[model samples]
Target: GMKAILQLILEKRQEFEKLPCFEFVRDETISPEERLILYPCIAAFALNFRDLNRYDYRDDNSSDYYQKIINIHTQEDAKHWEWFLNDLELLGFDKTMRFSEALRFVWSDDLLHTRRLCHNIAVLSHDLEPVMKMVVIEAMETAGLVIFHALAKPGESIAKATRRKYLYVADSHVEVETGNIITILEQTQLSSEQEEKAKEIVNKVFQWSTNLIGEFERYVKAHRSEKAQPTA
Candidate 1:
């Protein structure tokens, strides 16, 4: 049994895994797109966070400055743009050529804003309690994992096996990313001020991802019975 005040990670994981889903579909082959016309919204979010890394290098173990674990996971969302582009290639489409390079343009603008937002946070992080901060981050990380799992219902068949495999890979990495957050929190101690500020940032990120998932749901609704991945 779990403590009343605490949420069990496994509970959240199971809840998402049980949702009904369609078969996997490659972003390329599908035509007559409806849902997720703005699927590139993630690019906007990713770009917003990248500057956090550029300013702080928060995910690098090699760098003494990366006192933040959440930053590392957040940073990888940018890499998601690269992955999405590849998925487009699998679909035989060219976002770079035809879409006027939407991903790069969005990422570039958002990251610029994030770089400046990160400055004061880096200088002031030591004012918080590290373990508590980590635990909070873990909760948010759990939510992130839930989004991917629910999006990739196992029974659904996609156009290509690669898209199928990639879904599971995404699931596994979410856990690993959360683990990295936990590990870093265990090692560092934070001041009260730093902890409070970190809690706020964690909440902000949670809302951002949660809202994105909401948007994803709305995006999927426009598809109804059909399936499409916008990579192509």
Candidate 2:
């Protein structure tokens, strides 16, 4: 049963991955004040889905093939969401309003993936297999790191200290977690196509992040960074 759910997450995870997750931050064209809330809210929503996954992994009651790493991820991601929430608040966002709506359309589907992951593990409906799912997790998270880099690096106007700080922390988490992922590679049981797909997912999200940054940068260029206000 767990294998089935993992399989489902892998499929949905692949679907989520199909989006330009790592594409460049499209800052070159859009005005940030107009969409500031949209992107960050979208980001927040993404983190939330991840939050559910991390938590599901650590669920003690559910035979969720447990791991200390899952706990770490859950705790760390709470910080990640908190960091984004801070940015949203500063931007004058109503966390319960339009932002929720934005997430409903743009981010909530990942929740379905999360629930499947949790249910499978908790029910232990099948023999627990080693978590090869890290293939996708590592890939997706790597792309996530690139996305954060766009907002965290110095000399960027759209990125405030808090915002940048959150990205840096998340990047560091991915780097650390990735080393653990390398262990799975040693399993030597993976197919060539799966490996290639993993690489592609990582590359794609990184590009999306990069494009989003570039797009936001353009917004700053026309509107001025410090002076920009929220519109999304």
Top candidate (TM-score): 1
lDDT of 2 by residue, 134-217 (tens): 443444454454445433322134444334433322345445434333333344444555555444444443444444444434
What 10-residue stretch in candidate 1 is worst by lDDT? Answer: 20-29
Error in Å for residue 181 of model 2:
5.7
Number of clashing residue pairs in every model?
17, 31
Predicted candidate 1 versus true structure: per-residue lDDT over 92-111, tens digit per residue: 33344536566464444433
What is the C-alpha local distance difference test score of each model? 0.42, 0.42
* C-alpha lDDT (0 to 100) for residue 45 of candidate 1: 43
Candidate 2: lDDT over CA atoms?
0.42
Report the poorest 10 consecutive residues by lDDT, candidate 2: 121-130
The segments of candidate 2 whose C-alpha lies over 4 angstroms from its true place after superposition are 1-37, 59-66, 95-128, 153-156, 159-232
